[PDB]
Amino acid sequence: MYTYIQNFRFFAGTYNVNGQSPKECLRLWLSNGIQAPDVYCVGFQELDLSKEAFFFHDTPKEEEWFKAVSEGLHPDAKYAKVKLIRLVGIMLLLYVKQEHAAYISEVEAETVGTGIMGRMGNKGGVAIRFQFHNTSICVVNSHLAAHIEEYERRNQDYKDICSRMQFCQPDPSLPPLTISNHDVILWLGDLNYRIEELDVEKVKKLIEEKDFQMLYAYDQLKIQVAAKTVFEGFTEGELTFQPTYKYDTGSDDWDTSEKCRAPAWCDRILWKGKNITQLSYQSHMALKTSDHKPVSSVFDIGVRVVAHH
Ligand SMILES: O=P(O)(O)Oc1cc(OP(=O)(O)O)c(OP(=O)(O)O)cc1OP(=O)(O)O
């Protein structure tokens, strides 16, 4: 027989829920204005901010946000859960259309904590790798170090997730599988890279002027990726939406606190691999449950399908 490449719809989502429980229907983020995707990749940050969850215990939030996502998915297709992985507050969900599950194999799920003392799960990354038909796919949900001046820590947090994240393969003699050893790599999550140089007022004025081209010129990730310190070989879509950090819970008004935190593109989606075509890169202003806004991305990814007779 022979193999050909078939395009599939992949959904990629990130949402920092800031220890909150779902108080809004997740249809606005997961299936509003889109065709039913073939594969769903739903990542989260700060799922539970309690002491109990921090000491690696279980949480009611896991099921709370799992039911909310399942219901929020596209109603035109029946979805089957492939895997669920969670490190403290960092979660990553994988769903496929029932019709695709038979062609899903070699599923692995690993966690890497890069937080307090570079080992705790407060900040780190979770990942689900699998094989859809004849193509190896790895999805990473990372929550890198917080605050503006901590850009060198964020670069190290990326290098840590990359070097420690190893998935077991069938051949034990072969070197362990790392994120880089995959046909398709989708990296999402709260990367926390802020906006440098500019004053809090200059950042807010640029968003009012809707001049995201000028604001992006000072984006810490863009600067670090150019310096070849992070996401080497990775691509990111043009930011057409306003920064998703920091809002007042229940509104679209910027942080009105003693801190008065300056806006930043904290939640990003980046890919690496052959046959990937990004169809969209949006933010969802409608969901006010957190101080962050959910970010989505829909791709047209090529998968090697076997042609029998
Ligand atoms: O390696 P082969 O036997 O020369 O090519 C075929 C392999 C097939 O899989 P299997 O190892 O025999 O189970 C095969 O089965 P299929 O009919 O595609 O489910 C057929 C093979 O040769 P083909 O009939 O595609 O020319």
UniProtKB/Swiss-Prot annotation:
Signal peptide bounds: none
Any idea which positions bind substrate? 46, 122-123, 245-246, 259-261
Q: Where in the cell is it found?
A: Cytoplasm, Cytosol; Endoplasmic reticulum-Golgi intermediate compartment; Early endosome membrane; Membrane
Please give the tissue specificity annotation from the record for this chain. Platelets.
Annotated coiled-coil positions are none
Top-level lineage group: Eukaryota
Sites binding Mg(2+) sit at 18, 46
Chain residue ranges for the region called 5-phosphatase: 5-306
In which family does this protein belong, per the annotation?
Answer: Belongs to the inositol 1,4,5-trisphosphate 5-phosphatase type II family.
Q: What is known of its domains?
A: The ASH (ASPM-SPD2-Hydin) and RhoGAP (Rho GTPase activating) domains form a single folding module. The ASH domain has an immunoglobulin-like fold, the Rho-GAP domain lacks the catalytic arginine and is catalytically inactive. The ASH-RhoGAP module regulates the majority of the protein-protein interactions currently described. The ASH domain mediates association with membrane-targeting Rab GTPases.
Q: How does it assemble?
A: Interacts with APPL1, PHETA1 and PHETA2. Interacts with several Rab GTPases, at least RAB1A, RAB2A, RAB5A, RAB6A, RAB8A, RAB9A and RAB33B; these interactions may play a dual role in targeting INPP5B to the specific membranes and stimulating its phosphatase activity. Interacts preferentially with non-phosphorylated RAB8A; phosphorylation of RAB8A on 'Thr-72' disrupts this interaction. Interacts with INPP5F.
User: What is the purpose of this protein?
Assistant: Hydrolyzes phosphatidylinositol 4,5-bisphosphate (PtIns(4,5)P2) and the signaling molecule phosphatidylinositol 1,4,5-trisphosphate (PtIns(1,4,5)P3), and thereby modulates cellular signaling events.
Q: Which protein is depicted?
A: Type II inositol 1,4,5-trisphosphate 5-phosphatase
Tell me the lineage of the source organism: Eukaryota, Metazoa, Chordata, Craniata, Vertebrata
| Gene that encodes it | INPP5B
